[PDB]
Design an enzyme around this catalytic site. Structure first.
Site, PDB file in Angstrom:
ATOM      1  CG  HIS A 160      -6.672   8.578   1.041  1.00 16.97           C
ATOM      2  ND1 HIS A 160      -6.901   7.308   0.508  1.00 16.97           N
ATOM      3  CD2 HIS A 160      -6.758   9.498   0.038  1.00 16.97           C
ATOM      4  CE1 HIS A 160      -7.128   7.472  -0.798  1.00 16.97           C
ATOM      5  NE2 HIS A 160      -7.039   8.773  -1.106  1.00 16.97           N
TER       6      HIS A 160
ATOM      7  CG  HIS B  89      -4.681  -0.660   3.857  1.00 13.94           C
ATOM      8  ND1 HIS B  89      -3.864   0.060   3.020  1.00 13.94           N
ATOM      9  CD2 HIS B  89      -5.492  -1.389   3.049  1.00 13.94           C
ATOM     10  CE1 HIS B  89      -4.189  -0.230   1.750  1.00 13.94           C
ATOM     11  NE2 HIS B  89      -5.182  -1.105   1.742  1.00 13.94           N
TER      12      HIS B  89
ATOM     13  CD  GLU C  22     -20.938  26.917  -0.566  1.00 14.28           C
ATOM     14  OE1 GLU C  22     -20.243  27.001   0.459  1.00 14.28           O
ATOM     15  OE2 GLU C  22     -21.696  25.939  -0.725  1.00 14.28           O
TER      16      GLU C  22
ATOM     17  CG  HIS D 113     -17.530  24.696   0.767  1.00 16.88           C
ATOM     18  ND1 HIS D 113     -18.604  24.486  -0.061  1.00 16.88           N
ATOM     19  CD2 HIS D 113     -16.450  24.242   0.095  1.00 16.88           C
ATOM     20  CE1 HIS D 113     -18.154  23.928  -1.199  1.00 16.88           C
ATOM     21  NE2 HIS D 113     -16.849  23.772  -1.126  1.00 16.88           N
TER      22      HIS D 113
ATOM     23  CE  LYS E 275     -29.085  12.285  -9.861  1.00 13.45           C
ATOM     24  NZ  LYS E 275     -30.503  11.801 -10.010  1.00 13.45           N
ATOM     25  CG  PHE E 276     -25.615   6.843 -14.033  1.00 11.04           C
ATOM     26  CD1 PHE E 276     -24.297   6.636 -14.329  1.00 11.04           C
ATOM     27  CD2 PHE E 276     -26.395   5.801 -13.616  1.00 11.04           C
ATOM     28  CE1 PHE E 276     -23.778   5.383 -14.246  1.00 11.04           C
ATOM     29  CE2 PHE E 276     -25.885   4.545 -13.530  1.00 11.04           C
ATOM     30  CZ  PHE E 276     -24.556   4.334 -13.834  1.00 11.04           C
TER      31      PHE E 276
ATOM     32  N   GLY F 172     -13.939   6.649  -8.260  1.00  7.76           N
ATOM     33  CA  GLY F 172     -12.663   6.578  -8.942  1.00  7.76           C
ATOM     34  C   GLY F 172     -11.417   6.481  -8.121  1.00  7.76           C
TER      35      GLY F 172
ATOM     36  CD  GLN G 101     -35.506  13.988 -12.278  1.00  4.27           C
ATOM     37  OE1 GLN G 101     -34.634  13.141 -12.369  1.00  4.27           O
ATOM     38  NE2 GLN G 101     -36.704  13.737 -11.763  1.00  4.27           N
TER      39      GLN G 101
ATOM     40  CG  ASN H 168     -12.468  11.972  -4.555  1.00  2.00           C
ATOM     41  OD1 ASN H 168     -13.521  12.595  -4.656  1.00  2.00           O
ATOM     42  ND2 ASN H 168     -11.397  12.246  -5.283  1.00  2.00           N
TER      43      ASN H 168
ATOM     44  CD  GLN I  32      -6.903  13.951  -3.252  1.00  2.00           C
ATOM     45  OE1 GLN I  32      -6.360  14.868  -3.868  1.00  2.00           O
ATOM     46  NE2 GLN I  32      -7.448  12.909  -3.859  1.00  2.00           N
TER      47      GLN I  32
ATOM     48  CB  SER J 118      -6.582   3.959  -7.641  1.00  3.27           C
ATOM     49  OG  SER J 118      -7.063   4.477  -8.870  1.00  3.27           O
TER      50      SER J 118
ATOM     51  CD  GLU K 209     -29.677  14.305 -13.291  1.00  4.81           C
ATOM     52  OE1 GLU K 209     -29.548  14.764 -12.140  1.00  4.81           O
ATOM     53  OE2 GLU K 209     -29.591  13.107 -13.629  1.00  4.81           O
TER      54      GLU K 209
ATOM     55  CB  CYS L 290       0.526   0.838   4.354  1.00  2.84           C
ATOM     56  SG  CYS L 290      -1.133   0.151   4.647  1.00  2.84           S
TER      57      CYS L 290
ATOM     58  CB  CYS M 190      -1.026  -0.034   1.139  1.00  2.54           C
ATOM     59  SG  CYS M 190      -1.987   1.496   1.210  1.00  2.54           S
TER      60      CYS M 190
ATOM     61  CB  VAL N 172       4.492   5.812  -6.806  1.00  7.34           C
ATOM     62  CG1 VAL N 172       3.145   5.776  -6.107  1.00  7.34           C
ATOM     63  CG2 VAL N 172       4.771   7.274  -7.105  1.00  7.34           C
TER      64      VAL N 172
ATOM     65  CG  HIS O  62      -4.334   3.481   3.457  1.00  4.86           C
ATOM     66  ND1 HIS O  62      -3.445   2.536   3.905  1.00  4.86           N
ATOM     67  CD2 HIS O  62      -4.562   4.321   4.496  1.00  4.86           C
ATOM     68  CE1 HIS O  62      -3.147   2.850   5.170  1.00  4.86           C
ATOM     69  NE2 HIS O  62      -3.810   3.924   5.564  1.00  4.86           N
TER      70      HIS O  62
HETATM   71 FE   LIG Z   1     -20.663  24.853   0.366  1.00  5.41          FE
HETATM   72 ZN   LIG Z   2      -2.581   1.165   3.301  1.00  2.19          ZN
END
Ligand SMILES: [Fe+3]
Ligand SMILES: [Zn+2]
Ligand SMILES: [Fe+3]
Ligand SMILES: [Zn+2]
Lengths: 340, 332
Positions: free
Chosen positions: B152, B101, B168, B267, B297-298, B145, B309, B139, B154, B147, B303, B41, B38, B47, B150
């Site tokens: 976390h 992890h 806003e 925010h 939901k897509f 998306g 919607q 995320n 950002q 990958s 939209e 980890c 990982c 990388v 672990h």
């Molecule tokens: Fe906001």
């Molecule tokens: Zn990890």
């Protein structure tokens, strides 16, 4: 160091939405890594002669076919919501309807795979529907959602058309923004933009006699495009028969380039924006179509518009220029039609 | 007939963005604690060959492929109405939640979550000294998306107010100017007194499926009292937000009994040196699932071309979130 957007991050403004897009070009300098349906399906609810989920049978159509969504998200007789000025929680009325449009009875032929004649028939149908619904609603939105990646359960090729008794978010904004530009510049924002891209060429993907499709300067999706007519035209219903057959050709070349990009059926969401039927002076408008596709690196690697993008601002690594260039690199004849 | 938003489609306004949402109510009636490879980890090489310490608690490192940098040159000035660009600097960092992890947010103890809040406060204070906007986010889930599993978050800092922030900021400012009270403070007190959209409520925090929510089970988490940035919470508010988070994310996972994906972020007032009393700290959680662990939901077609919607109403979503337990199913 001297600024060079091919190398340095920066933000690009989208004058149609009034928003910026963050671009990080150093992040897309890595080389590139490598890498059958029936014309009719018995259970397809969109196929000719089949019964839909509600039991209605579609006709033995030979070309396009339009029908009312069996689960329309809007209706024409919705009562009006009461008026309110609540700056925190307030709602307004919503009326409208939704229809589905099968492109052709061939369950397996997507747009880039239909003859220019068939595609011309599609444009016709789009015009007729836009013309009919516009008699009652100010915003008619024609669009298409293609591919499982876009959530489409049924792969039979088709589009959708929704009519609204109000101008939806995107429509009111583009309406407003185009109007200011015109009040200010004395020419339509997209008509001028077309001129600029025709002259540049760096973001051009397809150019025909009457149309131009470019990865717009402010594109958000990797291979997003903007297809516009080169002449000032307010609505799809205003195209001449020549612009109309040429649009058919432009579409075929554009979507063939998309499929050839990764040599696969390229998912996407596309739609047309034209002047609203609100009875006003709509000079400021310029009809156009947006295509927002999710693939980014291959047939399986796509772009996710999440996190930072949802909480802050759209961001992209691959430039609109590199995108357009990769799109110009492929052929504009569908791989299945050339056999190459 | 009489209009009835419980049965009739209508559009709800989002005052934080000044946009509407179309609602059609009629249509909704195993992992190890540590991985040897990982990159996130403790003690493993990332990388680039760089090595993470055998960390405890959170671990924050500069993204190895940051999308922004601190010394990018400026873009030339321009006032072109069609093709124009602007400068962009900042940096991005990754925040590992804890050395485990396999433990996602809802699975962390409250002490552990209190430490993440602390890291978020520190990172925000620090970057805000240099950048006007600091965006902490997360995320989560392959569906978003992500990958690396672990757990976390950002943090990206920007030298400019990105779209959502600028908007806003402006709308809260106009409202504050018109009403003399902050938009979200009044909002919270308003919902705290309704209950209709409440999903989590603690001594100092409230989480609701906002009235104008866009995603199915999207929520808005915010303090009951006026707080400008995360750095402003008192320590009690701070320990309380850890608890509110455990509760909210635990409900989310319980909904469909699975690790619920989403993108969430905070925010708060920008560090731009102006009077920002119009601000009110808040977190948004935009989850994609809709009916099950595999049904989402897509947000496309209509939209993307016209307007958001939804079929399930905010009230129905909140009711469903309240119906489950706030203790994670594995902890249960
Ligand atoms: Fe906001
Ligand atoms: Zn990890
Ligand atoms: Fe448009
Ligand atoms: Zn079919």
């Amino acid at each position: 160091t001297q600024f060079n957007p091919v190398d340095h991050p920066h933000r690009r403004y989208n004058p149609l939405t009034g928003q910026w897009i963050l671009v990080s070009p150093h992040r897309a300098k890595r080389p590139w890594q490598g890498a059958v349906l029936p014309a009719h399906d018995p259970d397809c609810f969109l196929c000719a002669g089949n019964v839909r989920v509600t039991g209605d049978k579609n006709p033995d159509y030979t070309g396009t076919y339009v029908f009312t969504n069996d689960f329309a998200a809007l209706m024409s007789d919705t009562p009006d919501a009461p008026e309110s000025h609540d700056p925190l929680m307030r709602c307004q009325s919503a009326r409208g309807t939704s229809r589905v449009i099968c492109f052709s009875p061939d369950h397996s032929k997507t747009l880039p795979e239909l003859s220019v004649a068939a595609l011309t028939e599609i444009v016709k149908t789009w015009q007729e529907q836009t013309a009919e619904l516009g008699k009652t609603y100010p915003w008619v939105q024609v669009f298409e959602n293609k591919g499982a990646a876009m959530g489409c359960s049924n792969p039979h090729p088709h589009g959708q058309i929704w009519a609204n008794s109000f101008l939806p978010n995107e429509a009111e904004r583009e309406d407003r923004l185009q109007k200011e530009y015109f009040a200010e510049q004395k020419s339509p924002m997209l008509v001028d933009y077309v001129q600029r891209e025709l002259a540049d060429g760096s973001r051009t993907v397809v150019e025909t006699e009457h149309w131009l499709a470019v990865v717009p300067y402010w594109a958000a999706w990797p291979f997003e495009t903007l297809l516009l007519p080169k002449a000032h035209v307010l609505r799809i219903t205003d195209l001449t028969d020549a612009q109309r057959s040429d649009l058919a050709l432009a579409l075929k070349k554009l979507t063939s380039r998309y499929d050839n990009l990764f040599q696969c059926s390229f998912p996407y969401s596309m739609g047309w924006h034209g002047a609203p039927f609100n009875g006003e002076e709509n000079q400021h408008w310029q009809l156009h179509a947006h295509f927002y596709p999710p693939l980014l690196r291959s047939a399986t690697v796509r772009k996710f518009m999440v996190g930072y993008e949802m909480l802050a601002e759209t961001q992209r690594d691959l430039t609109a220029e590199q995108a357009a260039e990769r799109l110009r690199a492929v052929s504009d004849i569908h791989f299945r039609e050339s056999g190459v």
